[PDB]
């Protein structure tokens, strides 16, 4: 699917999930054993960084809008990374538009 896949967070392997049902959409990374859990509210993300397709690394960082908070995820298969990046692009763009509409109004 396009909402889950294996990911590495802080050198810990786990499953990254994109929760769209609960507003605002939040990204949850859960360690394999469940000892570690991380959650980021996508309303806070400003830009979405991603390593180029011409590099052996498969990282994907979500910089937080304001020492701004930064969340970096490393993937295993690029297809999973692309399918996760594509869904994130929609959420970040939409929330950026919402902020633009709110500030303008």
């Amino acid at each position: 699917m396009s909402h889950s896949g294996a990911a590495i967070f802080e050198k810990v392997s786990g499953i990254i999930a994109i929760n769209e049902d609960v507003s605002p959409a939040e990204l949850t990374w859960r360690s394999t054993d469940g000892d570690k859990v991380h959650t980021v509210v996508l309303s806070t993300i400003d830009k979405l960084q991603a390593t180029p397709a011409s590099s052996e690394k498969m990282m994907l960082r979500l910089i937080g809008k304001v020492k701004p908070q930064r969340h970096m995820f490393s993937f295993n298969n690029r297809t999973v990374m692309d399918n996760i990046k594509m869904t994130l692009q929609q959420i970040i763009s939409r929330y950026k538009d919402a902020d633009i509409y709110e500030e303008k109004r």
Partner: protein, 49 residues
């Protein structure tokens, strides 16, 4: 792609399509703001159908 909407058109969409109003009245103040709602509506298959 940028699409422009107006209050008159918003009312017209509700009048000609009661389902859109049904999905509008129950969600605008509860979960997400109107700009997000209409952004979702056009992307949905409902707007295509």
């Amino acid at each position: 792609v940028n699409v422009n909407l107006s209050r008159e058109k918003i009312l017209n969409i509700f009048e000609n399509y009661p389902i859109v109003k049904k999905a509008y009245t129950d969600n605008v103040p509860k979960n997400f703001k109107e700009p997000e709602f209409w952004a979702r509506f056009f992307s949905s298959k409902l707007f295509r159908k």
